[PDB]
């Protein structure tokens, strides 16, 4: 199978991380993956299709 990857950083998601995934709230066509470190530190993310530039 495939191992998901964070949208901000390019590191794999670990099997018991406090991560999240959600559908882009602008386009609705790309899945955003966020890891625990990026969520805590408030690292911004950018959709790979529309470029909504969210937190």
């Amino acid at each position: 199978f495939e191992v998901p990857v964070c949208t901000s950083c390019g590191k794999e998601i670990t099997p018991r991380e406090h991560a999240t995934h959600f559908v882009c709230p602008n386009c609705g066509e790309a899945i955003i993956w966020r890891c625990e470190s990026c969520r805590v530190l408030s690292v911004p993310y950018k959709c790979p299709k529309c470029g909504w530039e969210g937190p």
Binding site: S8, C9, G10, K11, C38, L41
Partner: protein, 129 residues
């Protein structure tokens, strides 16, 4: 004071990567740093490094992609022969082909794999993985 700028560049890259940055700036530039970044880009650890001109020296703008675990300079710059790379590999890297040892030779700066192909030795300066 400032003794070694390559070490500072690599430690800054390591920390910024650890905490999740997109771009990084390396203020005192140098041709060694340029060549090391060239090798890292060839082997796929970074992307799109650029040189900027302020009247003092060069600045290096580097983009990161999420592939570096640890990057560091080797001090002292040990000399190494063509038949002794395995020892330093086992000392600095975690697997038999995992990461690169950067070597300065009389033919230029390269990886130890290329240096072994050519059958030469030199000085150890940096490691990346």
């Amino acid at each position: 004071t400032l003794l070694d700028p390559l070490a500072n560049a690599l430690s800054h890259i390591t920390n910024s990567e650890r905490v999740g940055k997109k771009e990084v700036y390396i203020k005192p530039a140098s041709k060694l740093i340029g060549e090391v970044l060239r090798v890292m880009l060839e082997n796929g650890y970074i992307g799109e490094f650029e040189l900027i001109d302020d009247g003092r020296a060069g600045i290096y703008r580097v983009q990161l992609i999420g592939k570096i675990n640890k990057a560091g300079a080797i001090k002292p710059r040990f000399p190494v022969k063509a038949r002794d790379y395995e020892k330093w590999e086992k000392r600095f890297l975690p697997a038999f082909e995992f990461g690169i040892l950067i070597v300065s030779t009389s033919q230029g700066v390269m990886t130890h794999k290329e240096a072994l192909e050519k059958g030469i030795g030199g000085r150890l300066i940096a490691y990346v993985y």
